[PDB]
Amino acid sequence: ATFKVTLINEAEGTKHEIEVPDDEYILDAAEEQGYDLPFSCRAGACATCAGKLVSGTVDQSDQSFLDDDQIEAGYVLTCVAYPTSDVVIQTHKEEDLY
Ligand code: FES
Numbered sequence: 001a002t003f004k005v006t007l008i009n010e011a012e013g014t015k016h017e018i019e020v021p022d023d024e025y026i027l028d029a030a031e032e033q034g035y036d037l038p039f040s041c042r043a044g045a046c047a048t049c050a051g052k053l054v055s056g057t058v059d060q061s062d063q064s065f066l067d068d069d070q071i072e073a074g075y076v077l078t079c080v081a082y083p084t085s086d087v088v089i090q091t092h093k094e095e096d097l098y
Contacts, residue, residue, distance in 0.1 A: 003083040007035065008054070008090050020083050026051075026058070027079045037078060037091060044080035047097045051078050056087030070097070 001022045007030065008015055020029040027049060030037050040048035044063040053074040060071075060081040075096070076089065 003056075004086040005029070005083055006054075006086075006088040007037075008088070009092055010090055011092065022082060022084070024082065025079060026081050026083060026087075026089075030078075038094065039079050042079045044077050046077075047094050049077055049079040050093045050097065051076050052090040052093045052096065054088035054090060056089075057084045058082060058087060059084050 002019050003022060005018050005020050005026060006015065007018065016035050018030055018033045018035065020026055027037055027039060038048055040046050044060070045065050047065060053076055058076055058081040060076055062080040063077045065077060066075055075093065
């Protein structure tokens with residue numbers, strides 16, 4: 001399957017739509033498609049690539065940084081997250097964790 005992923009940058013009021021395979025991490029697909037997103041560790045152990053789900057679901061089992069509460073709240077580490085449905089997500093939410 002291939003999922004539709006809507007990337008929203010609230011502070012800049014930008015919107016980008018990409019298509020991501022169900023076996024590809026969101027970050028990678030975004031870059032391939034011409035949209036550079038923030039990252040650091042690229043390994044699910046940091047907050048740099050954090051986003052916030054608006055709608056849809058993802059699989060981020062490879063993540064280690066977020067706690068249960070933050071996940072329930074909708075936070076996602078885009079560097080290690082695979083879409084599991086069409087998704088709408090707010091990017092650049094790193095500073096929401098401090
Ligand atoms: S860049 Fe560190 S968890 Fe994604």
